[PDB]
Amino acid sequence: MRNLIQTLVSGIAPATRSRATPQALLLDALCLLLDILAPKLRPVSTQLYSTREKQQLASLVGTMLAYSLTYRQERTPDGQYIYRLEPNVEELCRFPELPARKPLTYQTKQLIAREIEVEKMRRAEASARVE
Amino acid sequence: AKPVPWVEKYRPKCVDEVAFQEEVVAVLKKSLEGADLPNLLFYGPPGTGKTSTILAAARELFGPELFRLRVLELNASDERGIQVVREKVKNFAQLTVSGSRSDGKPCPPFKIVILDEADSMTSAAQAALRRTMEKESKTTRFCLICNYVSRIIEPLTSRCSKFRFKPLSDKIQQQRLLDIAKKENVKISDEGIAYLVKVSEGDLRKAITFLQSATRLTGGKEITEKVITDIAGVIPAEKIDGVFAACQSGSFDKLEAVVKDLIDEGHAATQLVNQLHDVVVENNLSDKQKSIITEKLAEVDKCLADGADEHLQLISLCATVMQQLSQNC
Amino acid sequence: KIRNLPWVEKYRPQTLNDLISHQDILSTIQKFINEDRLPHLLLYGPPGTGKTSTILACAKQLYKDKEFGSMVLELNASDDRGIDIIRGPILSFASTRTIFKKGFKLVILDEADAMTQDAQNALRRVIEKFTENTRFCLICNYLSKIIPALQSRCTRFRFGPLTPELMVPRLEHVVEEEKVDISEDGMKALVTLSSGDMRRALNILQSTNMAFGKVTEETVYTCTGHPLKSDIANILDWMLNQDFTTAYRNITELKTLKGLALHDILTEIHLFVHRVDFPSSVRIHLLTKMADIEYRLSVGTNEKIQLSSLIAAFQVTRDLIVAEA
Amino acid sequence: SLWVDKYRPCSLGRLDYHKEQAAQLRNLVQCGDFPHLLVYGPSGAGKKTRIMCILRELYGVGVEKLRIEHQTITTPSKKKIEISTIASNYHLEVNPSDAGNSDRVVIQEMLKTVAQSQQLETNSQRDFKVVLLTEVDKLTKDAQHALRRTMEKYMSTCRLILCCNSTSKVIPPIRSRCLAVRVPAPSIEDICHVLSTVCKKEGLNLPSQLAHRLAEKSCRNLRKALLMCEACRVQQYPFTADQEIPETDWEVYLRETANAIVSQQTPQRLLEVRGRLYELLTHCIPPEIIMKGLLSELLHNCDGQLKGEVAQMAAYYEHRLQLGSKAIYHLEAFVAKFMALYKKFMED
Amino acid sequence: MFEARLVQGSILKKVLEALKDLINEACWDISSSGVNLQSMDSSHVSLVQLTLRSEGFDTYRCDRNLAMGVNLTSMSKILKCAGNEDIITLRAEDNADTLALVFEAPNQEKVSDYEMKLMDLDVEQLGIPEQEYSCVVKMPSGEFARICRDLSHIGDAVVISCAKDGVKFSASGELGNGNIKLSQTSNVDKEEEAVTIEMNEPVQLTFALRYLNFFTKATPLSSTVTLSMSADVPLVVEYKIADMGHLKYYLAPKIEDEEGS
Amino acid sequence: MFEARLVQGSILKKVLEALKDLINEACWDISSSGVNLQSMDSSHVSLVQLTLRSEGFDTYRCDRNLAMGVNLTSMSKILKCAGNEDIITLRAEDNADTLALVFEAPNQEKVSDYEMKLMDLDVEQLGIPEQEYSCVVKMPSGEFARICRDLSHIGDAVVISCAKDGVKFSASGELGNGNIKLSQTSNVDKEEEAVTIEMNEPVQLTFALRYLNFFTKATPLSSTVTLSMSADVPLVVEYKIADMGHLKYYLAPKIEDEEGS
DNA sequence: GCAGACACTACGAGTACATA
DNA sequence: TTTTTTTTATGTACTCGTAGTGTCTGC
Ligand SMILES: Nc1ncnc2c1ncn2[C@@H]1O[C@H](COP(=O)(O)OP(=O)(O)OP(O)(O)=S)[C@@H](O)[C@H]1O
Ligand SMILES: Nc1ncnc2c1ncn2[C@@H]1O[C@H](COP(=O)(O)OP(=O)(O)OP(O)(O)=S)[C@@H](O)[C@H]1O
Ligand SMILES: Nc1ncnc2c1ncn2[C@@H]1O[C@H](COP(=O)(O)OP(=O)(O)O)[C@@H](O)[C@H]1O
Ligand SMILES: [Mg+2]
Ligand SMILES: [Mg+2]
């Protein structure tokens, strides 16, 4: 758990690393962070999303890129691909005997991963255009 | 022309500037004339002037050019293991006493080893100092400085002459603070200086820091009692009366409310223990209730000195005084 | 010639006749030396009683100045005394002959309680094998840190605390050799505050003579900072005779007036708690509370709260003692 | 960027609460001869924001350009230990508690090298450097004893701003050498004003009742209040007055643990509760916060004549936990003592 | 597009060894005049500047002012795989997040390409005042390296004095003082052994040993070395590396002891 | 004012490397006759008596007599960086603590002044008896070093005997015994390789091999060594330097107890 | 005369334990 | 009828692996 905490902390930008200790980030800014990162999203294309849904997706990928969190595909012995966070902070947050909560679907997490990839390349192009 | 904080600007350069520690200052002034300086063990509360006295004595004895050749100052900020005592301290104590003062002032025929903060040294490293102090006493001297004399072993206690630095009385501390405020062109009222010497509790470093910070806060105008109460962290009497009313109520919900309100206001638990202790010893409670409550206050202060949680210790103390106040109701 | 030395090192008993207290032990050691029957010695006792001075006087009596460096191997806690030193320099010193003059050699091991158990186990057959050639003197303050195998091989002498009746003439010799004006109560305060230790009685004498120029009772108790007997009697009378507030005010005024420390007050009140004919249930509670208060003063703890608890430990038992009748 | 970091104030004149303290801190650091500071208060009060505002007031706007620096320190046991450091061109930010019991080796070696050297450029930078020792209450007493002569010798070229939660864990030699600055937690009105200004700058509308409930549930922690407000905005955009506020899992896990304690008093239930306490200690929750949550939930189930005894037992086993090294022994001893007291109270 | 070509592969293979244990990263500033690197250490004591002009390269392409941030631990292992007399081409795209180094194998049969991830570091230029120094002297490079190495076995901090006579190195410790001097060595056949003085005001400043050792780790790039000192300005150690450019080291002095009378 | 001047630095290096693992600290007794050093080892078993003459130095001045006790590890580190063909100046003031070693670099360009802090040990003078010995053997130093190295492989304590025939070495060890006896080896072309017996009464004494092997490290100082033995006085190993002085090693016999049977 | 091979001791590194 | 792993902070002692290095062999 300490190795996972240090791996989560070392990925954040140093401008926001100084604003909170890892202890306070673990106690206060992890479960609420995961509740921020998991909104109610229909499994529909962004094209059919409303302008408000596009703004919510832009805010979601902004706070995903701020903390260097991303979804990647994981293999299972049962034969089904899944999407999981590459820093797996759900085991940092969640507890065994705690009431179940609704997870995001496969289409929504694939949409978030594709959006974070195109947002990283758009950020690279914007930084090339500024410089 | 850089500014310097007043704790270092008003450090005693000579032994005549050290305040209230008359016996050790008289011993060091006799040793300045040529008397046989013994091994020294300075111990007492923080801020009483143990380091400044021996640095002023070393500066008076050796001058500027012989401080690097006659004084070895080791503190807890550097490594003092068994090998540092066996190699570095013994080889320094075995050196010759050469070098004379160029200003014509007399120079003593010994070196000085200032082992500041000797509490942190281990028992083996303190046991390695014994025959180094005894055997090399012709050419060097030792000055152990600590806050607790119980953490220094009894052979080193026996080998050194023990001087206890008392907390500074209100007369000497007030005189020194008024001299510092006169030399800095700042004006402080009598109520302000009375509350300052009440708050500082014999810590002259704390008093100089509070005086400098009150000067910087007000900009150089008159320092009243209100800025001293603001910067000293003193809990107001309304909070203490509310705590005692919550204890006299006998309900634990109001007790939890006032404890959480004092914790959320960031008040230090040591200050709350001091103010509650003053209120308890200065009211009309019975002797048994005062006895039990002051014993719990001492236990709570000991627990806070061991780094326990403030909220749990304060709620335990508040539960004890609530039980005592509701016993007679 | 005049030398700038502390009085605990300027006035050292270079001969066995200058030590004061342990006359039977020193007579036995003198008869060991005069008959050349000196065994492996084990000198133990509290600090400041004259064990290192005893073995240095014996070594200077046994050996001349032209051969002292080849016959005596003195090692202490400032030296490295690991098992490679027992197998190295100590074994080579014990197993070889002398250089200049024929005789038996001496290995002084000062602070023998600081040695590791491996070194103490390696020393056993070095002591037993070369008894004819060399002799060993182990000196310690704590006998429990020396293994029983080394305690069996060395005959042990308990250098107990120096009685104040025999501590006075040596202090008088130091006073008459230093031109110090001292009264009878000053000497009594010196031998009271020393408590079987001649280091602390010389240190206190030198410190008082430098601080004040005279050595009386008031000057000694002011330079040391120790409370007087009358102050402790007043503190006990206030804690047993009146309520919490008046006793607290009087003890606080007495501590602020004279600059007293709570550790010495606790020690003297502990000494007074056994002379006073308390009930046995009261004495157990008082000793437990005073031990707790003494333990709480070893850390960063406010001394005013601990003074209030010291008053509280007696204000608890006031009505118990009175109603016991 | 979250709402905790997007609308953080940059200067001392932009603080929503403790404005008098902001003016006093601006007057304190203007001359440059200010002593070492000890910023203490509850978590989430705004201590680090005020420290960064003090640094802006001292140096330029270059204190916001921070970077990660890695240092390798050799212990006396010759074990190389890696320590991260937030740094700028004017100051450094060190957390020595990441070295644990080796934190003294950070103070004796890494810090003094900072203190013993003057600065490169004395025009863009000022006459002194600042070192921010974060969370000095978690330092061992050896490190705090190594701190004091470094703080006293080189205080004209290196100023220090220690930050902590409780000053009782700081030794009196360190507290004597620094000016203690108390930052209390903001009140309910201040947190409601902060949340209203954040929602207005985001273009949203926030009811007063919802902001009052957020400030009540956050327990005067502005960071947790802002995170809860942003989570409530994410999970439901129309801000209802009775909207369900999300909660942390370890807090509700502590509540369920204390419910499991008070439900049955048996050694089998004690072994289940010990498993729950390992689950809590597994997720890097500090044991004093576990003890505080256990007390705060168990006092809701006790009677009026048992709460003082339960609180005294909690404080006693918390102190014994601080004296020791294995938290599970003292936690299970507290739970077993409470079970014995609760069984005695219920059967009598 | 950043495209640079080296004329000799030994320049990087003698300039990256000093920065291996000195600075934690390499920040290259791309400009029309040349490449600039200004890095401060983690202790905020030492500062490294390296300015290589565009005329010293075989070819140099620069259209936009860019900055690349590379680590040192991977670049040091990449440098040791390269040869000595081979050519090294540095390539960096406008949109990519990596830097490519292409050189020749030591077997001289294949081309080796190594790619490094560009670390996004947020730094600012400190800005040297470039003020007039109170003492400027010239020394041999290898002699200065031997001088700094000889005082390593004596003490952990050295004292540099510079009067009009010459430059005096001292190292006072528990063993004893080691004092060496250099003065008036202009009567030699080689032009690189001329120890000369160029200013007037004498200075005496105490510096650390490890930073001067890391500074003398970059000796054989230049034949001579230049030392600059003043009352409060840091020590400046300058190498004029052939024709491509120059390297500067800034070392802050130690805090002086309380030697009041 | 004391000022000695070694014409070459090799002899001081050989002396301080002979005593490095043996002597704890060097006590140079200074007079107008020369430089004397009588120091025991750390085990108080061996004794070293070095006597260097004033005529062997380049310049030797001594106003008042001195006794300079100094550490040996520091002087060993100073003499490690000293040439074998350079002039080395030892300086000492009247009432100062700095013993100065001034020498030149191996490049023979720059000067080097290394100070040492004198120790303040009060050491009682050890009386050398200077009596007649019952066995005096002149033998080559290299053969003595070789035979000590060859007996170090067999045992640890060696019984050396001497009689009218010659010297004899025995090592009763764990592998077995090794008995090497040499005599009348003066019938060669060389003059250094010769065994000469001068005295009468046979002696047999047992010594440690570690101290003999430490004593044999002065082999380049003298081509011919002298062994003096008797029934009471210790083992003396005398090295006669060519034009500087001499070196005496004293080693005490071990305690050997016969079997009761 | 100089390159290769041999054992030699000094030094760096990992590990355990410390009680009656 | 039941078995894995690193923290405690120094100081010492043991054990083992590695690397300059003095010396011997040979063309
Ligand atoms: N007796 C005194 N006379 C004059 N100034 C004093 C005195 N005591 C303290 N001061 C001032 O307070 C500063 C702190 O004094 P110190 O000598 O460092 O205290 P201290 O005895 O070292 O406390 P500790 O135990 O080390 S925390 C000094 O630099 C002075 O400015
Ligand atoms: N019996 C004594 N007679 C005279 N002076 C004494 C006597 N005992 C102690 N002293 C004084 O105390 C000094 C030191 O005594 P030590 O020989 O160190 O005693 P010790 O009991 O061996 O101490 P420890 O146990 O090693 S700390 C002497 O040089 C005297 O000044
Ligand atoms: N004056 C203020 N106005 C608005 N927000 C604030 C103010 N002060 C603090 N905050 C916010 O409250 C949080 C407090 O966290 P921090 O500043 O790290 O204090 P602490 O160190 O006590 O937790 C920060 O995230 C900050 O954004
Ligand atoms: Mg101090
Ligand atoms: Mg002794």
**DSSP line for B241-273:** HHHHHHHHH--HHHHHHHHHHHHHTT--HHHHH
Helix axes C184-194, C217-224, angle to 10 degrees: 30
CATH of the domain at F53: 3.70.10.10
Pairwise CB contact (< 8 Å): E255 & D116: yes
- Rg over alpha carbons for chain A, rounded to the nearest Å, is 16
Cβ neighbourhood burial of E185 (10 Å; 0-12, 13-18, 19+):
middle
Residue F114 lies in a domain: yes
User: What strands, in cross-sheet order, belong to the sheet with D91-94?
Assistant: D67-74, D80-87, D91-94, D129-134, D158-164, D36-40, D178-182
From the list C84, C72, C114, the residue with the least C-alpha distance to B128 is C114
Q: Which class would CATH give C4-162?
A: alpha beta
Contact F74 E175 (CB under 8 A): yes
Q: Identify the residue whose C-alpha is closest to ligand 3 atom 25.
A: D4
Which residues in chain B are contacts of E260 at CB distance < 8 A? 13, 59, 64
Say which residue the tokens 């490679």 belong to.
C84
Interface of D with A in 62-101 (CB under 8 A): 64, 66-68, 84, 86, 93, 95
B to F contact (≥3 Cβ pairs closer than 8 Å): yes
Asked whether E244 and E160 are in contact (CB, 8 A), the reply is no
Amino acid (1-letter code) at residue D337: K
Structure tokens at F208: 């440690």
Residue D285 to residue D278: CA distance in whole angstroms:
10
- Three-class secondary structure of residue D153 per DSSP: helix
Instruction: Determine, yes or no, domain membership for F70.
Output: yes
CB F123 within 8 A of CB F225: no
Residues of D in contact with B266 (CB under 8 A): 40-42, 45, 182-185
C-beta atoms of B233 and D155 within 8 A: no
E vs C contact (3+ beta-carbon pairs below 8 A): no
- For chain F, the farthest-separated pair of C-alpha atoms sits apart, in whole angstroms, at 72
> Amino acid letter at F30?
I
Q: Between β-strands E167-170 and E157-162, what pairing exists: parallel, antiparallel or unpaired? A: antiparallel
Contacts with E99 (C-beta within 8 Å, 6 or more apart), sequence order: E68, E70, E90, E91, E92, E115, E116, E118
Q: Which two tokens stand for residue F129?
A: 């008896």
> Are the Cβ atoms of D92 and E40 closer than 8 angstroms?
no
Q: Which residues of B161-177 are buried (b: 16+ CB within 10 A; e: fewer)?
A: bbbbbbbbbeebbbebb
CA of D100 to the centre of ligand 3 (A): 27
| Ligand nearest to the CA of residue B169, numbered in listed order | 1
Q: Do F115 and E182 touch (CB under 8 A)?
A: no
- The conformation of residue E234, written as its DSSP 8-state character, comes to P
B21 vs B17: CA distance, rounded Å: 10
DSSP state of E254: B
Element (H, E) at D94: strand D91-94
CA E147 to CA F179: how far, in whole Å?
Answer: 53
Tokens, residue C243: 């309520």
Give the residue from B98, B100, B138 with the most F CB atoms within 10 Å of its CB, the best one to mutate: B98
Q: Which two tokens stand for residue A2?
A: 């300490």
Interface with chain E: mutation pick from F110, F113, F118, highest number of E CBs within 10 Å: F110
Q: Which residues, other chains included, contact F32 with Cβ-Cβ below 8 Å and sequence gap of 6+?
A: F54, F62, F65
Closest-approach nucleotide to residue F153, Cα vs C1'? G8
Note whether B326 and B250 are within 8 A (CB): yes
Tell me which H or E stretch contains B311. helix B310-327
* F49 touches F38 (CB < 8 A): yes
DSSP per-residue letters across C216-265 = -HHHHHHHH-PPPHHHHHHHHHHHHHS-HHHHHHHHHHHHHHHT--HHHH
In chain E, after which residues is the C-to-N distance over 2.5 Å, breaking the chain? none
Which residue ranges of B make up the annotated binding site?
A: 44-51
Could you tell me if the CB of C47 is within 6 A of ligand 2?
A: yes
Pocket of ligand 1 (CB under 6 A): B 7, 10-12, 18-21, 46-52, 147, 204-205, 208; D 148, 152, 173, 176
- Residues whose CB is below 7 A of strand G: C 117, 144; D 78; F 21, 153
Q: How far apart, in whole angstroms, are the C-alpha atoms of residue D340 and residue D270?
A: 11
Experimental method: cryo-EM
Distance of CA D169 to the CA centre of its chain: 13
Q: Do B162 and B176 touch, CB atoms closer than 8 A?
A: no
Ligand 3 and D48: CB distance under 6 A? yes
Cβ–Cβ < 8 Å for B113, B142: yes
Does F115 reside within a domain?
Answer: yes
AA identity, residue A68:
S
The number of distinct structural domains making up chain E is: 1
In a domain, F221, yes or no: yes
Q: What is the distance in angstroms measured between the alpha-carbon CA of C73 and the sugar C1' of G13?
A: 35
Q: Considering chain D, tell me which residue range(s) the CATH 3.40.50.300 domain(s) occupy.
A: 19-182
Whole-number Å distance between alpha carbons of A70 and E120: 18
User: Does residue E179 sit within a domain?
Assistant: yes
In a domain, F180, yes or no: yes
The CATH code of domain D249-347 reads: 1.20.272.10
How many CA atoms within 13 Å lie on the side-chain side of E155?
20
At E76 the three-state DSSP class reads helix
Do B191 and B226 contact (CB within 8 A), yes or no? no
The answer to whether A26 contacts chain D (CB < 8 Å) is: yes
Q: Which fold has domain C227-317?
A: Zinc Finger, Delta Prime; domain 3 (1.20.272)
Angle at C34 between CA C29 and CA C35, to 5 degrees: 100
DSSP assignment string, F127-184: -------SEEEEEEHHHHHHHHHHHHTT-SEEEEEE-SS-EEEEEE-SS-EEEEE---
Domain of residue E39, residue span: 1-256
Q: Do B255 and B319 form a contact (C-beta atoms < 8 A)? A: yes
- Is D224's C-beta closer than 6 angstroms to any atom of ligand 3? no
Q: Is residue D234 within 8 Å of A39, Cβ to Cβ?
A: yes
Find the distance separating the first CA and the last CA of chain B, reported in whole Å. 66
Interface of B with C in 32-71 (CB under 8 A): 34-39
Domain-embedded: residue E261: no
For the CA of B176, the closest atom of ligand 1 is: 4
| Spatial separation of the C-alpha atoms in residues E173 and B145, rounded to whole Å | 25
Q: Do E175 and F116 touch (CB under 8 A)?
A: yes
How is chain C split into domains, by residue range? 4-162, 163-226, 227-317
Pocket flag, ligand 2, residue B155 (CB < 6 Å) = yes
Given resolution (angstroms): 2.9
Residue F261 in any domain: the answer is no
D19-182 CATH pick, 3.40.930.10, 3.30.70.1060, 3.40.50.300, 3.40.50.720? 3.40.50.300
Per-residue tokens: D3: 């709402």
Q: Are E183 and E165 in contact (CB under 8 A)?
A: yes
Nucleotide nearest to F152 (CA to C1'): G8
* G chain positions with any atom within 7 Å of a protein CB: 8, 10, 13, 19-20
- Kindly report the length of chain E: 261
Q: How far is the CA of C81 from the C1' of H13 (A)?
A: 13
Encoding tokens for residue B210?
């509070």
F120, B99: Cβ pair inside 8 Å? Answer: no
The CATH code belonging to domain C163-226 is 1.10.8.60
Report the nearest residue to nucleotide G12, CA vs C1': D78
Q: How far is CA F68 from CA C132, F43, F114, in A?
A: 37, 22, 16
Report the distance separating Cα D116 and Cα D191, nearest Å: 43
Radius of gyration of chain E (CA): 20
Query: Facing residues of C137 across strands?
Result: C41, C108
Per-residue b or e along E12-44, where b marks 16 or more CB atoms closer than 10 Å to that residue's CB: bbbbbbbbeebbbbbbbebeeebbbbbbbbbbb
Neighbours of C249 (CB within 10 A): 14
Choose the mutation target among D59, D63, D66, D67 for the interface with E, i.e. most E CBs under 10 Å.
D67
Helices B287-305 and C280-296, axial angle in degrees (round to 10): 40
